[PDB]
Symmetry: C3
Subunit: 776 residues, 3 copies
């Protein structure tokens, strides 16, 4: 119940409109919390909710304390954070709920309260730079001897999600520019409405301006300096939404002296927060306390909006410090790094000059960290260009104990735009330029191929089918990239279709041995847990439906017991082929497989340098071999207006079209093909509840992949799974935090011994090293 007093939109609204002149808020805060609980956790019964709230009220009462943000922080601090060997750590039994709590509330206010109200032993120096971890000897030594490995680690943004809020305070005006740009589309309009339906761009600037000005006020309190005596002129928090105050009709700003030069840094915040709570150890004024409550509500609300929004001015905020800070953050505390092989996903750009700036800035950041850590003679003291960075980077020897980097651009997809005879045409011409821009950069300086080791495509699956990238990835292959990871988008309209998309990537795309497939939730989720909280009937596009049935018949024709579904799949598929292709003559199910087997051919080669070499590469195979009707259908399948009209139409598909065993049969059938190619699979963080079908982490599909007998199914051919922290869904995240999360749930929920619990997860961690993209 503590989270609902720190991250709640409705409670924020009521406090913001209440002036400070009256502090009769005991009933107002209570009623909003119940509503706030109602809009976050619907299923929680009311009788339990009222019972839990009453305990918290008396828990504050028996503490000779008043209800406030300081009061909430205290009960949270003594509940979750306990001092241990490495300073302040987290209780192992209570770590599962802590990760859920970080999905709603930031950790910096919480750590400040614990340090002030329960300091670390011997007053030893402690500065917050990493998220809190629970200490376990079994796993800690594994970190010491074998560093962690990270695969899906994006570079845009910052080290974590919280300090981006600090970067938001750096340029509040720039925040509107990016907020307005997204808000123009209706997709972001509903996304913001989901968190705050009463949200407008002007209101957003108010809260950002309100939060900054509250921070200035409370920083004055922490400084020990007397307030500027405009407190009598201040009664409404809304007065802080314009960065100006009046005193007898006089213009007075909010500027104040900071002994810490970088007032917009995480170090400044923790230093400010600790001093604030120390001065409020026994009693705090009601007026000042509510300002702290508002600031906490603003910070937790914006970050709640930010994590959803992530899945111009902000891009060019610093562009070099974040890259350096990321590697220092990824290194971890201590002399020796906790991460050995860390590969990054950087956003490609359509400007060749901007590309040179992007690669230089990140490579300069990588060299800066290595120079700071490893004192070793450098050819150039200041490289100032990519050529000289490679001169510095070619000197260093890989000894493992420092972070090894392998940049991998991630191609981005867009909505299927009509026209040009096939729905993904502006996409392909844009993607073709992006690849070509990287091509000339690589061929100009071949030494760059030691760091640009792979290519990724992580936007969606509905927006763009996998087979569109077959001409793209293969033409990258002739440039010496030699690694292609495909991040399948898990927004499948049907689970069978989701498995169908996985098979397309394997068969069509050039997933050579050693490559990876990220976010393979479809081939991981349990069919029994997918059906929950779903309507009796689903809906998906006819083209998806037709490709689904053909794919079903490809894997269900082999099974003797699961045969009646394949025969019915063939019967229904040809009937849809009659409706979709609008063909008059006879059509056979065998021809459908043959036609769709050709889908890996290029976009323009269906009508038939590196690209022109690839052009006739798939054109010759079409002409030489005998069949022509599959080409005629494939040509019709691509560039026929009626076919395009029919494909976009939606159809009604029963939820239980394939029974539980049959879906498992498909899920295991693709697994065998998955393991044959020896393709590793990136795993999203467990706390990332994007799918939202998992009510608790204990039923996450990663447990079934690892082979836990409580969750594994018969016929499950083992896979190889690698970890990754890409879209955590929580404000304070790190790989080591996720590593502990895997260990805690296995130790507590499953009862596995600590020695064995590490062993099962160590296999997952080491697989990132087995299938690394870094050169030997």
């Amino acid at each position: 119940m503590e989270r609902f007093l720190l991250n709640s939109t409705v409670l924020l609204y009521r406090l913001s409109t209440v002036s400070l002149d009256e502090v009769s808020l005991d009933e107002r805060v209570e009623s909003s919390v119940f509503l706030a609980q109602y809009e976050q956790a619907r299923s929680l019964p009311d009788h339990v909710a009222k019972s839990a709230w009453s305990y918290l009220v008396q828990q504050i009462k028996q503490r000779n304390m008043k209800l406030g943000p300081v009061a909430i922080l205290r009960l949270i601090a003594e509940k979750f954070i306990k001092n241990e060997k490495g300073g302040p750590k987290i209780d192992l039994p209570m770590f599962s709920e802590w990760q859920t709590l970080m999905s709603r509330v930031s950790c910096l206010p919480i750590i400040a309260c614990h340090q002030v109200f329960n300091p670390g032993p011997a007053s030893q120096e402690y500065s917050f730079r990493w998220p809190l971890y629970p200490y376990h000897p079994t796993v800690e030594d594994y970190i010491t001897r074998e560093c962690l490995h990270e695969t899906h680690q994006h570079l845009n943004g910052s080290t974590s999600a919280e300090e981006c809020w600090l970067d938001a305070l750096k340029h509040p005006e720039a925040c509107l520019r990016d907020f307005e740009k997204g808000w123009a589309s209706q997709e972001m309009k509903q996304l913001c409405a989901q968190i705050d339906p009463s949200l407008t761009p002007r209101i957003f600037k108010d809260r950002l301006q309100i939060a900054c000005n509250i921070r200035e006020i409370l920083c004055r309190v922490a400084q020990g300096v007397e307030l500027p005596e405009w407190i009598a002129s201040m009664q409404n928090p809304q007065q802080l939404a314009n960065s100006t105050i009046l005193h007898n009709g006089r213009e007075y700003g909010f500027a104040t002296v900071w002994p810490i030069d970088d007032k917009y840094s995480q170090e400044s915040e923790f230093c400010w927060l600790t001093g604030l709570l120390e001065k409020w150890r026994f009693n705090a004024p009601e007026g000042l306390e509510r300002l702290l409550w508002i600031y906490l509500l603003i910070q937790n609300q914006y970050l709640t909006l930010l994590v959803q929004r992530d899945d111009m001015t902000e891009l060019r905020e610093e562009t070099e410090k974040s890259y350096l800070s990321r590697f220092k953050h990824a290194h971890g505390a201590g002399v020796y790094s906790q991460v050995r092989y860390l590969e990054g996903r950087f956003a490609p750009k359509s400007d060749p000059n901007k590309m040179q700036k992007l690669l230089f800035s990140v490579l300069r950041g990588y060299w800066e960290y290595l120079s700071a850590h490893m004192s070793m003679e450098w050819v150039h003291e200041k490289p100032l260009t990519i050529s000289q960075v490679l001169d510095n980077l070619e000197l260093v020897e890989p000894h493992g104990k420092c972070v090894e980097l392998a940049l991998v651009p991630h191609f981005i997809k867009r909505k299927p735009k009509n026209g040009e005879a096939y729905p993904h045409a502006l996409l392909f011409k844009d993607l073709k330029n992006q690849a070509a821009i990287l091509m000339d950069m690589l061929k100009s300086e071949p030494r760059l191929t030691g760091w640009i080791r792979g290519v990724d495509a992580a936007a969606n699956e509905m927006h763009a089918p996998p087979e569109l990238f077959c001409p793209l990835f293969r033409v990258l292959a002739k440039s010496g990239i030699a690694h292609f990871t495909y991040h399948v988008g898990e927004d499948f309209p049907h689970l069978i279709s989701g498995i169908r998309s996985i098979d397309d990537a394997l068969r069509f795309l050039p997933l050579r041995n050693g490559d990876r497939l990220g976010h393979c939730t479809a081939i991981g989720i349990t069919p029994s847990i997918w059906k929950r909280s779903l309507p009796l009937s689903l809906s998906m596009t006819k083209e998806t439906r037709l490709l689904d049935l053909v794919f079903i018949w490809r894997e269900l024709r082999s099974h003797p017991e699961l045969l009646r579904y394949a025969s019915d799949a063939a019967i229904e598929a040809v009937r849809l082929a009659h409706k979709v292709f609008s063909l008059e003559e006879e059509v056979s199910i065998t021809t459908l497989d043959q036609v769709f087997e050709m889908r890996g051919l290029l976009a323009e080669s269906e009508g038939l340098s590196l690209w022109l070499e690839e052009y006739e590469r798939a054109r010759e195979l079409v002409k030489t071999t005998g069949m022509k009707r599959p080409l005629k259908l494939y040509k019709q399948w691509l560039t026929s207006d009626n076919v395009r009209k029919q494909r976009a139409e939606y159809v009604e598909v029963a939820l239980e079209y394939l029974p539980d065993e049959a879906v498992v049969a498909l899920q295991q059938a693709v697994m065998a093909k998955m393991a044959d190619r020896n393709i590793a699979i990136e795993c999203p963080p467990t706390s990332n509840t994007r799918i939202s079908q998992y009510r608790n982490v204990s039923e996450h599909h990663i447990f079934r992949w690892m082979g836990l007998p409580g969750e594994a199914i018969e016929g499950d051919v083992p896979m190889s799974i690698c970890l990754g922290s890409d879209d955590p869904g929580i404000f304070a995240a790190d790989l080591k935090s996720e590593f502990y999360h895997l260990f805690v749930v296995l130790t507590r929920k499953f009862g596995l011994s600590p020695a064995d619990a590490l062993r099962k997860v160590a296999e997952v961690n080491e697989n990132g090293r087995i299938y690394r993209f870094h050169d030997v």
Copy 2:
């Protein structure tokens, strides 16, 4: 010298030895063997003050073994805290001084102070040392001791606990004076017996040390329990009462 003296001596008596001289060597071995029999049996002032700093160096060399690389990587050598604050400070310096010179011969790198002669300069030389896995990592752990229960004073251990309360302050104030020693003073132990005092006696002593930055606590469960069922309860007392976190150790859990 003893080995060199004996090897040359045994060569001279390869075929025969004079009867009187041979018996003297026989007598010498019995005296040495009997003394060593008593010495190791004592456990179950001037002895350690011959040089008090060179013997600690010799311990690491013996622990290191032959070859360039030591066969033991981690080594936490327990030592007895001293009731004199100055004497303990000199005792702690000698162990660290002996440790650094062992690194000096083994390592090949610069030193901040060529002649440390004090704990402050030793720590400066020691912080520059990075353990690469071949040398011996050292972590001093003072181990306490007990005696028979002191009759009276409202409970059996009030005069005994007073010395332990003093000894912790002897360790603590020096630790507070030089907080840089936290990385080498890591654990606290108490290895005398069980009948001397129950394990819960150290609960206040461990908690104050824990909150003052020791960060580790090992307890030596002595195996002199009057009955086997009694010995199990002594282990239960340590677990239920002592503040043992996840990563603490127990010695001789034979019971």
Copy 3:
């Protein structure tokens, strides 16, 4: 079927005599190939062979090429080699078949062909120095983590067999005189007639001279320069055996100046081949192309002869470059070595000055290898002597990243020379001379024992009894060698005899804990494979039979089920003993047991400084217990002319003398003895096709040791198994290939998971360093 089309003696003979004027050789190349297909592989049906030839021709017509190496190399290169991240890598499915091909055809033309037609991506530079390996991320990770461990690497010769061709070209007469001197032996006469009956010393010189002249004339074509017009007389290729053409009384020397300074390196030849094939992408002239076809034929013929022959000035042509190249090749194409603990065996030489230079040269080359890789201040810059090299190498610590070395001399033996109290007498004095030479050099420099660690005896088995090395090894033990390995020869007339030979080595030789054994094929092979294609009766010396029969009785008296064979052994032994010993008064089986137990005693000492110390030791132990019946018999068993004639007689023993389980019981008895003594088994290379009993590598006996179900019979005792790339049987050899060759079979031929297969071979690789002779 391309193997027969690039290595076939009859085709090369027919191409040599037939002039360059004919263009249609299909009527003869087809007849020659089918004939050559017979003798090389006489186990293929004619119709299948006939169909394969037609398909090969039909595939050429598909690519409208002309029948020749440019056509043949294209098909082979595209079928096997695939471009990958590290360059050209063999396909995993085709690796097993590739290794069989490698035993007969060099990969240098194949890799050169692939580089020309489908080169490396992004114009990345590919330097051809190492043989191709298949790429698997699982195995690659482990080998980079824990480097490969090698045990049996012969220092003599160059890195691989391919450049011994290059040396042979560089030494037209030195390799001729080595062949000419070896031609006198009748054994070499049979071997040379085996590969080709028309092989005479003159014929050998003609073909080498032909290859030298063909290489130069094609080099001129490769460089682009026009031909020097002497081709007017170029009709019969046989003219190329005179080093000078005749054209209007003009002497034309075929030698031309190469652009590269050295004309006898792999890079020199590979770059030449790429230039040659590049100009012949479309078509080639028949006269020049046939010259290339001819050139490949002598190369393939001689390389097949060289590797089969293994069943001086040339060795010491450089004596510092060859070993450095050997160390460089063993290091691998990387900064850190692929092979950590490499044991370089070398042949000891009786001449002190000759071998003193050799020992310094290999140490200097090893030191030169470390200096090139690792840089620091050395004790001396130009050692020029054995003492300064050792002082230089004392500074280098074992770091693992480079190659660690430990020389182990392997004694070479001769045929048994009758006389002087024992049949191997002139040998023993030569070996005693060799040991004394080795001992005094250890006195010259005590540090030599740091690198001189083991002693080996690898020539054969039937010639030298294993007990003969008891006095040789023991004196070396007191000399501070501190390790010994015995390499039993696999020429055992009977499988039971092979078991006895390993038993004799364990009993008598001072093989203490940690010592190794080599080529222990006798115990590994199952009886079913051994009897394949053997005659129903086998012949062996009466000396061997008596030793085996008593051995059978010693290890079968315990087993209740196979008890009659133990009794049959005793009765047959005493019956045979009366024939051999020619004794009137009967001899018990127990008396025979003690007679053969005294085989360890020195023959000279039994007939009666360190040599006299051991001489009296055998005499002393004899007189401690007064048996006086066996000792008198043993004296007769060694120094009786009538007995020595009887022991040399051959006796016919049935092939199935003992049942399959009886041999199994005998084997597991030895498997028990190796467990107690903890003796390793450095297995010979898996591609070494010399046992000729396995129809494929799938039936290699090593898998029985590994414990795979379906190959490990019940009752077997686990061993410790090392690896050695000593006698690969293939052209381009490395331990890296062997590790992948084993990995492929378990993953593919045995259906094991990649995680499982790596673990089993990791246990084998680890044993290569658990029992390594390198000092701690």
